Design a protein around this ligand. Structure first.
Ligand SMILES: [Mg+2]
Ligand SMILES: [Mg+2]
Ligand SMILES: [Mg+2]
Ligand SMILES: [Mg+2]
Ligand SMILES: [Mg+2]
Ligand SMILES: [Mg+2]
Ligand SMILES: [Mg+2]
Ligand SMILES: [Mg+2]
Ligand SMILES: [Mg+2]
Ligand SMILES: [Mg+2]
Ligand SMILES: [Mg+2]
Ligand SMILES: [Mg+2]
Ligand SMILES: [Mg+2]
Ligand SMILES: [Mg+2]
Ligand SMILES: [Mg+2]
Ligand SMILES: [Mg+2]
Ligand SMILES: [Mg+2]
Ligand SMILES: [Mg+2]
Ligand SMILES: [Mg+2]
Ligand SMILES: [Mg+2]
Ligand SMILES: [Mg+2]
Ligand SMILES: [Mg+2]
Ligand SMILES: [Mg+2]
Ligand SMILES: [Mg+2]
Ligand SMILES: [Mg+2]
Ligand SMILES: [Mg+2]
Ligand SMILES: [Mg+2]
Ligand SMILES: [Mg+2]
Ligand SMILES: [Mg+2]
Ligand SMILES: [Mg+2]
Ligand SMILES: [Mg+2]
Ligand SMILES: [Mg+2]
Ligand SMILES: [Mg+2]
Ligand SMILES: [Mg+2]
Ligand SMILES: [Mg+2]
Ligand SMILES: [Mg+2]
Ligand SMILES: [Mg+2]
Ligand SMILES: [Mg+2]
Ligand SMILES: [Mg+2]
Ligand SMILES: [Mg+2]
Ligand SMILES: [Mg+2]
Ligand SMILES: [Mg+2]
Ligand SMILES: [Mg+2]
Ligand SMILES: [Mg+2]
Ligand SMILES: [Mg+2]
Ligand SMILES: [Mg+2]
Ligand SMILES: [Mg+2]
Ligand SMILES: [Mg+2]
Ligand SMILES: [Mg+2]
Ligand SMILES: [Mg+2]
Ligand SMILES: [Mg+2]
Ligand SMILES: [Mg+2]
Ligand SMILES: [Mg+2]
Ligand SMILES: [Mg+2]
Ligand SMILES: [Mg+2]
Ligand SMILES: [Mg+2]
Ligand SMILES: [Mg+2]
Ligand SMILES: [Mg+2]
Ligand SMILES: [Mg+2]
Ligand SMILES: [Mg+2]
Ligand SMILES: [Mg+2]
Ligand SMILES: [Mg+2]
Ligand SMILES: [Mg+2]
Ligand SMILES: [Mg+2]
Ligand SMILES: [Mg+2]
Ligand SMILES: [Mg+2]
Ligand SMILES: [Mg+2]
Lengths: 76, 61, 100, 59, 45, 111
RNA sequence: GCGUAGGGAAACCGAGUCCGAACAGGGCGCAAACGGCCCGCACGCGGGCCGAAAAGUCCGCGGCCGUGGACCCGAAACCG
RNA sequence: CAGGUGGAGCCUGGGAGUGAGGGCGCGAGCGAUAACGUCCGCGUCCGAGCGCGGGAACAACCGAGACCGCCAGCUAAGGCC
RNA sequence: GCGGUCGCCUCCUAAAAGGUAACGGAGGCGCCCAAAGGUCCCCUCAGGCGGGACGGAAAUCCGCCGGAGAGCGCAAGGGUAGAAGGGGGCCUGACUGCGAGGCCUGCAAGCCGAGCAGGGGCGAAAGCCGGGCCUAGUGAACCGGUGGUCCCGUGUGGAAGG
């Protein structure tokens, strides 16, 4: 057989769901492209990884044509 | 007979005041013509976990 | 033993300076005792007396350190901590040792 | 409107989360009756084991 | 081509990497030393 | 032909601005006049207005701009507002757009 | 001998120390437990006392581990 | 956010054994829409319930979790010439 | 046994979180780029039809139509023109000293990262910059080499060696 290979599962996906309490640092989404875009108080690292910029809670936003967004609405 | 301290362990590990086992960080002095300065810089000591229990046990003395 | 895999003998010694063949190098070892510790004494306090008390240990030279509060007594030692030299200069007097 | 639940069929061979419900209720033995507060949460488990239990309404 | 470029006194050796035969010149560029601050930095060894 | 260098360049520069979080000093300039608007996004609301067609002034529109520039400061700085970003939209930071910005002096600024 | 000081490769300093330009930051570290009797204002205080308890350490016992034949029996073999 | 006091949960530690699984159901790959085949997934039982009832006999299908005693009663599956 | 395989990335298998096996179905990595890096400013494709010397299916040009089927150094996927793509100007942050907090996770590793300080780059500024659209381009420890630097230097000053 010429096959037999594969790579390590990269455990990608959302790490904090809407209405979850996070903290400045907490990475909120692990993804390949820009499947989710950084919203309010949400940074995104060189591997497109979204994280809380401040403490607070997590909320999602589907801006249709404009894509989907993860916001960290404060409370801190 | 008297137990023997493990010199391999003593040469590369330290037991802290609270009984933590603190070792250096692997992978920073051999192949770094360029790893990120963040990479080579993040080489202080760390703490081994639940298995320094074993390292501790070969230094005891 | 980890079953054949390399163990955690895979970390690199830092404690560089492991010693060489003629051996350990003779040099004055200082042992620190705190102010709070000798607060029990009244009279003198010499590195000699402090062994009998059970604090000094015979192989080491005397160095009094900070933690604790000072007392108006004459304390004889080989070295004093910054914090300690001050703490007691406000009460008592203390000599430095270096004879024989 | 309290509920009277009664274990009538053995859970030997049913999913573990179903043995969990029979527990959440307090049912430990066959034929055992237990009268509990009729609430949404308490009904959840009662209808989950609906095939092993027999339910009546009581005062 | 593994590369280790240095400063201009007390050495330094903050190593980088130029792959090819072009850049093939002195292969130098402005960088920052751990000592003073921001100097020339040239390439060697 | 969907979207244009205009509409594009407009978003491009304006999208960046809206990230930094500050209040937006949006500048719309026309052939005859030049207007200025301090907007707060997330509240979707304007705070301080300052036009030239609203101050009925004229005479050399690079010099008019600066006037409506200083005009925006006064009105605004009196409301607490000090620090802001400054749009610029489709217009290169130049001429009467640059002028109004240079006029926005006497009020928070950094520009 | 163990314990009463730790941090550092070390020099060394020390309730701190190490990295550092840092009076950033972080790593690893220091912080007396109760009752009650005394007093500074009375219901505790603030610190002390009277002895409960205890870091620690010592011996006994028990589990388990390290080294030894190490739960018992058994090779094919190797060497003098 | 609520109910849920359970041989529940969490934390620190002492002692382990296991690291050869198997049948069945369901979902796939391999195989031949073969195997009491094989490899995963989610469940279950046997494993350790080779104790009890049914299935003629039969680890895992149905019923049912056996602390002890009774020449008492009601039932489950399954049955009632 | 013979043959094949052995680490890393992509896709499916995988049963709509994560994860998941087989000598299951298919591909790819062991590099590369001083610009293919940072920043500021501009620019928008592929195709299709019509038009136009040498121009041909296709060289360069004009017109309309063309939301992305182009491009993004190479596999695949995800992503993406409201740029991550194309062009130019300055520049080298392919920084030093750190690091809140997390992702992942048996260990050891691997990954993302705000913010502070030093000294800088581009920008009017807001600001961005601790390499590259991202996910492969990799190797614990031991033993040594090389350049520094304080540190130790076996009676002492050196030196040897660390
Ligand atoms: Mg496989
Ligand atoms: Mg995969
Ligand atoms: Mg949806
Ligand atoms: Mg690289
Ligand atoms: Mg091996
Ligand atoms: Mg059953
Ligand atoms: Mg370097
Ligand atoms: Mg001890
Ligand atoms: Mg010491
Ligand atoms: Mg030490
Ligand atoms: Mg230093
Ligand atoms: Mg220092
Ligand atoms: Mg500090
Ligand atoms: Mg601390
Ligand atoms: Mg006692
Ligand atoms: Mg005792
Ligand atoms: Mg034994
Ligand atoms: Mg024998
Ligand atoms: Mg012989
Ligand atoms: Mg609750
Ligand atoms: Mg339990
Ligand atoms: Mg436990
Ligand atoms: Mg244990
Ligand atoms: Mg095994
Ligand atoms: Mg197995
Ligand atoms: Mg299996
Ligand atoms: Mg099983
Ligand atoms: Mg099974
Ligand atoms: Mg069978
Ligand atoms: Mg069926
Ligand atoms: Mg079968
Ligand atoms: Mg089988
Ligand atoms: Mg079943
Ligand atoms: Mg067995
Ligand atoms: Mg049975
Ligand atoms: Mg069972
Ligand atoms: Mg039998
Ligand atoms: Mg039987
Ligand atoms: Mg039978
Ligand atoms: Mg039977
Ligand atoms: Mg029972
Ligand atoms: Mg019974
Ligand atoms: Mg009957
Ligand atoms: Mg019946
Ligand atoms: Mg019959
Ligand atoms: Mg072979
Ligand atoms: Mg899945
Ligand atoms: Mg065309
Ligand atoms: Mg044509
Ligand atoms: Mg033509
Ligand atoms: Mg595409
Ligand atoms: Mg591609
Ligand atoms: Mg693609
Ligand atoms: Mg795509
Ligand atoms: Mg470009
Ligand atoms: Mg450029
Ligand atoms: Mg961390
Ligand atoms: Mg890696
Ligand atoms: Mg890359
Ligand atoms: Mg070796
Ligand atoms: Mg060496
Ligand atoms: Mg070496
Ligand atoms: Mg010297
Ligand atoms: Mg000698
Ligand atoms: Mg000498
Ligand atoms: Mg050397
Ligand atoms: Mg040297």
């Amino acid at each position: 057989t010429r096959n037999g290979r594969d790579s390590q599962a990269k455990r990608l996906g959302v790490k904090r769901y809407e209405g979850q309490v996070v903290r400045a640092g907490n990475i909120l989404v692990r993804q390949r492209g820009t499947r989710f875009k950084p919203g309010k108080n949400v940074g995104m690292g060189r591997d497109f990884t979204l994280f809380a910029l401040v403490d607070g809670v997590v909320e999602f936003q589907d801006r249709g044509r404009l894509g989907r967004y993860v916001h960290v609405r404060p409370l801190a | 007979p008297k137990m023997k301290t493990h010199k391999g362990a003593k040469k590369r590990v330290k037991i802290t005041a609270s009984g933590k086992v603190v070792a250096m960080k692997t992978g920073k002095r051999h192949l770094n013509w360029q790893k990120s300065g963040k990479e080579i810089r993040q080489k202080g000591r760390k703490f081994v976990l639940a298995k320094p229990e074993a390292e501790r046990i070969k230094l005891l003395l | 033993f980890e079953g054949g895999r390399s163990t955690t003998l895979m970390r690199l010694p830092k404690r560089g300076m492991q010693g060489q063949v003629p051996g350990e190098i003779k040099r004055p070892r200082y042992q620190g005792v705190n102010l709070k510790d000798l607060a029990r004494f009244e009279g003198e306090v010499t590195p000699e007396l402090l062994v009998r008390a059970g604090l000094l240990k015979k192989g080491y030279r005397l160095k009094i350190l900070g933690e604790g509060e000072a007392k108006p007594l004459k304390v004889v030692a080989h070295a004093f901590s910054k914090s300690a030299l001050e703490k007691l200069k406000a009460a008592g007097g203390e000599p430095v040792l270096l004879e024989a | 409107p309290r509920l009277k639940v009664k274990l009538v069929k053995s859970p030997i061979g049913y999913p573990k989360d179903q043995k969990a419900a029979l527990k959440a209720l307090g049912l430990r033995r066959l034929q055992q009756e237990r009268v509990l507060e009729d609430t949404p949460a308490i009904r959840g488990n009662v209808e989950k084991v609906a095939h092993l239990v027999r339910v009546e309404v009581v005062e | 081509l593994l590369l280790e470029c240095t400063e201009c006194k007390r050495r330094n050796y903050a190593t980088e990497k130029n792959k090819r035969n072009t850049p093939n010149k002195l292969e130098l560029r402005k960088y920052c030393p751990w000592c003073r601050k921001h100097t020339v930095h040239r390439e060697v060894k | 032909a969907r979207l244009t260098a205009y509409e594009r360049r407009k978003f491009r520069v304006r999208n960046r601005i809206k990230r930094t979080g500050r209040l937006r000093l949006s500048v719309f300039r026309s052939l005859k006049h030049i207007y200025a608007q301090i907007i707060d996004d997330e509240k979707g609301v304007t705070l301080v207005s300052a036009s030239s067609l609203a101050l009925k002034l004229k005479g050399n529109k690079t010099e008019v701009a600066r006037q409506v520039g200083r005009a925006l400061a006064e009105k605004a700085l009196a409301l607490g507002i000090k620090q802001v970003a400054f749009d610029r939209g489709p217009y290169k930071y130049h001429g009467r757009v640059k002028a109004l910005a240079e006029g926005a002096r006497e009020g928070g600024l950094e520009f």
